[PDB]
Amino acid sequence: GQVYTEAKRPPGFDRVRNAEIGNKDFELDVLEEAYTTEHWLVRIYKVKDLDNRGLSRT
Amino acid sequence: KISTEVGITNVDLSTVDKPKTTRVTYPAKAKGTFIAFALFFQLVDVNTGAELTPHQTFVRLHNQKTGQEVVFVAEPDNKNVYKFELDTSERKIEFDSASGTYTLYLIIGDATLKNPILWNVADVVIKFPNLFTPKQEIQHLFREPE
Amino acid sequence: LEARLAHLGVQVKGEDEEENNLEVRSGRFFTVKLPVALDPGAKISVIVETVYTHVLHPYPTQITQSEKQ
Amino acid sequence: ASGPRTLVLLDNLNVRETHSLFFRSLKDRGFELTFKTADDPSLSLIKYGEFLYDNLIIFSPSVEDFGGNINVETISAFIDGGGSVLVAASSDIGDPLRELGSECGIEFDEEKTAVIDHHNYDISDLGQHTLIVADTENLLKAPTIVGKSSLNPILFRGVGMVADPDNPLVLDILTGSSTSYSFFPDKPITQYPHAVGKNTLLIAGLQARNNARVIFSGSLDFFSDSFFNSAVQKAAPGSQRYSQTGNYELAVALSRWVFKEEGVLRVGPVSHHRVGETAPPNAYTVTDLVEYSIVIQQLSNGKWVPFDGDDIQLEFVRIDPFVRTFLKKKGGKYSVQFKLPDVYGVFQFKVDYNRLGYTHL
Numbered sequence: 333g334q335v336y337t338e339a340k341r342p343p344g345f346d347r348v349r350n351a352e353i354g355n356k357d358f359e360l361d362v363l364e365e366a367y368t369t370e371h372w373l374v375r376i377y378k379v380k381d382l383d384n385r386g387l388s389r390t
Numbered sequence: 391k392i393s394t395e396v397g398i399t400n401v402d403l404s405t406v407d408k409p410k411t412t413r414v415t416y417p418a419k420a421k422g423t424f425i426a427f428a429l430f431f432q433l434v435d436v437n438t439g440a441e442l443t444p445h446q447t448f449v450r451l452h453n454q455k456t457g458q459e460v461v462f463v464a465e466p467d468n469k470n471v472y473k474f475e476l477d478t479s480e481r482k483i484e485f486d487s488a489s490g491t492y493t494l495y496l497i498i499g500d501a502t503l504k505n506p507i508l509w510n511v512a513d514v515v516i517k518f519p520n521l522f523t524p525k526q527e528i529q530h531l532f533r534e535p536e
Numbered sequence: 537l538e539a540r541l542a543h544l545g546v547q548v549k550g551e552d553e554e555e556n557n558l559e560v561r562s563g564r565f566f567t568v569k570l571p572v573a574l575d576p577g578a579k580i581s582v583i584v585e586t587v588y589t590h591v592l593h594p595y596p597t598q599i600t601q602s603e604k605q
Numbered sequence: 606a607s608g609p610r611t612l613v614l615l616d617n618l619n620v621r622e623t624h625s626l627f628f629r630s631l632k633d634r635g636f637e638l639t640f641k642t643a644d645d646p647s648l649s650l651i652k653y654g655e656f657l658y659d660n661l662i663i664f665s666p667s668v669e670d671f672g673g674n675i676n677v678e679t680i681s682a683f684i685d686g687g688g689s690v691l692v693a694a695s696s697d698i699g700d701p702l703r704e705l706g707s708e709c710g711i712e713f714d715e716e717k718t719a720v721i722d723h724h725n726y727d728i729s730d731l732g733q734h735t736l737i738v739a740d741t742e743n744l745l746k747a748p749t750i751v752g753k754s755s756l757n758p759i760l761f762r763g764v765g766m767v768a769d770p771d772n773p774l775v776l777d778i779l780t781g782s783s784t785s786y787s788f789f790p791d792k793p794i795t796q797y798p799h800a801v802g803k804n805t806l807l808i809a810g811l812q813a814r815n816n817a818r819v820i821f822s823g824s825l826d827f828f829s830d831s832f833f834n835s836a837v838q839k840a841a842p843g844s845q846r847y848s849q850t851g852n853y854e855l856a857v858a859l860s861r862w863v864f865k866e867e868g869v870l871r872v873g874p875v876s877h878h879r880v881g882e883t884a885p886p887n888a889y890t891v892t893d894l895v896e897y898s899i900v901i902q903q904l905s906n907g908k909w910v911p912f913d914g915d916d917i918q919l920e921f922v923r924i925d926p927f928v929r930t931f932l933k934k935k936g937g938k939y940s941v942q943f944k945l946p947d948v949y950g951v952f953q954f955k956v957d958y959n960r961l962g963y964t965h966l
């Protein structure tokens with residue numbers, strides 16, 4: 333919800349569904365990013381390992 | 391900073407009626423069995439008539455069979471008389487498992503007293519309703535040829 | 537750096553190059569045959585040029601996306 | 606094991622004198638000790654993505670500014686990089702120490718709250734009955750973490766804590782007596798106290814998934830030269846009066862355990878093959894006898910001797926264990942032979958040896 337996909341549209345627009353995104357900003361708890369192709373056509377994430385200190389998250 | 395005996399007037403065990411009452415002195419393991427229950431307290435200093443709130447006024451329930459111990463704090467009432475009540479329907483999280491017999495220890499500690507009591511009063515009956523050790527062996531069950 | 541040498545070439549001031557034979561006589565010393573023999577008191581500008589490879593290591597081994605190696 | 610170089614923080618430099626015996630013992634094992642003032646500016650645990658000090662020790666309650674590079678986040682990264690951290694706290698914990706405790710799953714009590722006991726406080730308290738005399742009865746009962754000898758009552762004068770019930774890793778090396786509640790010294794209780802019962806650990810310790818031992822010690826006063834050389838006698842009328850506290854043995858045992866000295870297990874080369882062969886063949890056929898052999902070592906004073914390994918369990922698992930047998934010791938190798946299960950597919954030999962007070966495998 334930051335990229336300007338279209339000339340005159342709200343920042344964070346979706347071309348395929350012609351609608352703005354709802355969850356503008358969030359942080360993936362378990363899936364750290366690993367790669368995202370130039371056109372954002374295929375995104376590859378990577379499941380994080382179990383937390384070292386044994387905390388509930390990650 | 392003068393220390394005096396904690397003392398006890400009347401440990402009154404009154405079973406809850408879903409209300410008969412019994413009374414027992416400080417050095418007297420209450421005879422009988424109580425099934426649910428609120429008990430009456432009366433703390434008073436000696437050598438001078440003076441009810442003195444001690445810093446620690448607990449009520450410990452001990453499960454001899456399972457080893458779990460739950461501690462309940464006691465609150466002074468308007469009559470300067472602590473009262474401990476067990477609903478038998480509330481506190482599901484507090485009492486997950488039901489045990490037929492529970493030890494009902496009494497703990498009263500204070501910074502400026504010289505008689506920390508731990509004597510259990512009686513038995514309570516409540517009817518409200520690992521990885522480190524090696525695991526059990528598993529053996530595959532082979533198929534049978536025709 | 538003996539086990540890292542890339543091409544090592546010798547020269548003489550002006551348009552010339554020399555042959556550096558590789559022999560053992562230990563750091564694999566290179567024998568260079570001067571084009572013109574020099575008598576005592578002579579001077580010969582030998583522009584020795586070498587190139588070392590794989591000799592630069594990044595001290596911070598794991599930089600993030602935005603750091604200078 | 607880990608590197609000898611250890612960095613020790615101090616509230617004031619005058620602690621080394623008061624803590625002379627324990628530091629000397631800690632230096633018997635060849636450790637290189639660098640003492641830094643808690644508030645020293647040039648305090649750098651990490652530099653250019655490489656840790657300088659292999660182990661960290663903290664003896665500084667009443668701190669709120671660790672220094673240049675020492676942060677709770679940096680300490681968490683350290684513990685994630687295999688470092689071993691030892692801490693202490695005496696009624697002056699401070700917000701950074703509480704944050705670091707919370708990260709590992711141990712809920713330190715309030716700043717001014719000290720564990721209290723009325724039934725069992727020795728005659729040397731001289732004041733509020735807070736000189737807890739932790740008996741040997743309630744203990745971890747392990748051979749590596751708390752040693753193997755016999756101990757006398759251990760004097761404790763500190764702030765209690767409570768383990769988080771979400772953490773499986775957290776192990777309670779000690780627990781307070783059934784009367785210890787750990788609340789404010791002189792204040793009435795109108796709400797449930799912190800760790801009112803047997804949950805006031807006071808020597809709680811961690812064991813990370815990557816084998817980074819951490820030992821959140823209740824009280825700094827526990828390591829005091831006075832406590833090491835003092836006599837113990839509970840104030841209960843007519844209790845025994847031991848001439849020696851028995852604290853030194855426990856302190857030395859916990860120090861050795863936290864520095865990967867007493868218990869460490871390393872997994873050597875593994876080998877699996879058909880019965881009667883010498884090399885692991887690709888794609889074992891269904892219902893084919895298979896033999897598995899794995900060497901294990903124990904690190905006894907650095908000798909790396911073979912582990913006794915009574916109960917090590919091999920699991921042949923696809924998504925859930927199809928086979929689970931006991932490896933049999935034979936000439937230093939743990940070897941077992943078993944027919945492969947009828948079901949085909951991919952499988953996983955998965956020797957897992959997780960035991961209390963040992964390394965994970």
Ligand SMILES: *[C@@H]1O[C@H](CO)[C@@H](O[C@@H]2O[C@H](CO)[C@@H](O[C@@H]3O[C@H](CO[C@H]4O[C@H](CO[C@H]5O[C@H](CO)[C@@H](O)[C@H](O)[C@@H]5O)[C@@H](O)[C@H](O)[C@@H]4O)[C@@H](O)[C@H](O[C@H]4O[C@H](CO)[C@@H](O)[C@H](O)[C@@H]4O[C@H]4O[C@H](CO)[C@@H](O)[C@H](O)[C@@H]4O[C@H]4O[C@H](CO)[C@@H](O)[C@H](O)[C@@H]4O)[C@@H]3O)[C@H](O)[C@H]2NC(C)=O)[C@H](O)[C@H]1NC(C)=O
Nearest residue numbers: 527528529530531532922923924925926927928929948950
């Ligand atoms: C397509 O993909 C699918 C998705 O993966 C595949 O479907 C999977 O298939 C496997 C196996 O076929 C299933 O596992 C089986 O589940 C059975 C039912 O689930 C139980 O769930 C409860 C347990 O829940 C958890 O319990 C613990 C708790 O921590 C946990 O460790 C455990 O992993 C589990 O998650 C349980 O309470 C319920 O009552 C259900 O039983 C279950 O019965 C199976 O257990 C078998 O098998 C496993 C390994 O196969 C053993 O480890 C077990 O101990 C138990 O072993 C028994 O059967 C063996 C032969 O299979 C014998 O050798 C054993 O001795 C033992 O036999 C005893 O019992 C027999 C009667 O049952 C007696 O005759 C004997 O005498 C013995 O007394 C197993 O766990 C997956 O659940 C399933 N996935 C899903 C999503 O459902 C599918 O296979 C794929 N397609 C193809 C073609 O492959």
